[PDB]
């Protein structure tokens, strides 16, 4: 990033440590007015996304105690999990756009090669999708 | 609610299945000018426009795509379309916030 | 005279014709020079006012001396770019003669 800024270490390390005020950084986070906790969407996957969210929130709890696309829309209407982790193989998947997630795996396809593809490019999702 | 739909010869389709879209136009950003920005106008929604099989011209079906109308006040505009019995999408005037400026703040240290 | 075409798609011929007969769609030359892709015009709407004749900064389009080209079929009126060039080829000594005889008054 273009500007001067402090660099930290590793997830559970610096996160849970500052969360437990082990980090000196936790102190400056304490004296700070209207602190801001910026957690990226990319960080949440990373094998154990929930653990990171729990750690960062703790930091939010501490500050309060001391005092002084296709994403946010669905969660505005509760389409969670959102992740494809429900499976449990389910026949006849219905792509709105498999150009993105079609790169992943077609594991349901031998069980059911059929895939409706409602895209707007022949990229990725179209070739591996019937209809 | 002075509806005048019968008086205008306009076909029902275009007092119905389309909407006006009142707004004060944004400054062209390439420009530094401000003049054209002000004063409400009453653009309609776009419809289909294909292509001439010959010569490639943009042949067009909709009766009234190019129509546009200036105004002095928004309330007058909304009331205007109401007199016409028009569906509408009023949008806020979005004047830029005033900003502090200082030639010497560039020379703090 | 070099044999290169004059038109450079400043496109204001479109922008000043009252009948708006003209339609232009420029795209870059491979060399990178500005050029038209489908300059076209249609005598069906053109009113022969000669605003285009005035407007062109590089003096490309010119209202030629020829006055007779009445034709059988409407589709022929709607000149393509290539057609205009062919007209420019047919008459060039003539047109250059008129402009030579006239420009000082402009």
């Amino acid at each position: 990033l273009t500007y001067r800024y402090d660099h930290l270490g590793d997830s559970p390390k610096i996160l849970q440590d500052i969360a437990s005020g082990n980090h000196p950084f936790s102190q400056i986070l304490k004296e700070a007015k209207k602190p801001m906790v910026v957690l990226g969407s990319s960080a949440l996957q990373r094998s154990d996304g929930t653990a990171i969210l729990a750690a960062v929130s703790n930091i939010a709890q501490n500050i309060r105690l001391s005092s002084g696309a296709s994403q946010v829309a669905a969660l505005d209407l509760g389409y969670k999990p959102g992740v494809e982790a429900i499976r449990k193989n389910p026949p006849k998947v219905l792509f709105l756009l498999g150009a993105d997630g079609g790169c992943i795996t077609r594991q349901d396809l031998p069980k059911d090669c059929f895939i409706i593809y409602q895209g707007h490019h022949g990229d990725v999702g179209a070739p591996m999708a019937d209809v | 609610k002075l509806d005048i739909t019968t008086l205008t010869g306009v076909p029902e389709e275009h007092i119905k299945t389309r909407k006006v879209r009142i707004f004060v136009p944004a400054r062209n950003n390439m420009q530094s000018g401000v003049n054209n920005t002000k004063k409400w106008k009453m653009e309609f929604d776009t419809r289909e426009r294909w292509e001439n099989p010959l010569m490639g011209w943009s042949s067009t079906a909709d009766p009234l795509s190019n129509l546009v109308l200036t105004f002095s006040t928004k309330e007058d505009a909304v009331a205007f379309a109401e007199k016409n019995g028009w569906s509408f999408d009023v949008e806020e005037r979005k004047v830029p916030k005033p900003k502090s400026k200082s030639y010497g703040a560039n020379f703090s240290w | 005279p070099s044999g290169e075409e004059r038109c450079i798609a400043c496109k204001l011929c479109e922008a000043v014709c009252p009948a708006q007969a003209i339609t232009i769609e420029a795209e870059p030359r491979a060399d990178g020079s500005r050029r038209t892709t489908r300059y076209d015009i249609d005598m069906t709407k053109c009113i022969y006012c000669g605003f285009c004749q005035e407007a062109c900064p590089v003096d490309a389009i010119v209202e030629g001396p020829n006055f007779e080209f009445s034709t059988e079929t409407h589709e022929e009126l709607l000149y393509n770019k290539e057609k205009l060039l062919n007209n420019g080829d047919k008459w060039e000594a003539e047109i250059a003669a008129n402009i030579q005889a006239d420009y000082l008054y402009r």
Binding site: L109, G122, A126, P127 | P53, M55 | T37, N80
Partner: peptide, 18 residues
């Protein structure tokens, strides 16, 4: 006749199966 080639150049499905 029409001048200035094409427009969208939409893509088409591959010859190969699956």
């Amino acid at each position: 006749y029409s001048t200035t080639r094409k427009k969208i150049q939409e893509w088409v499905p591959p010859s190969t199966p699956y």
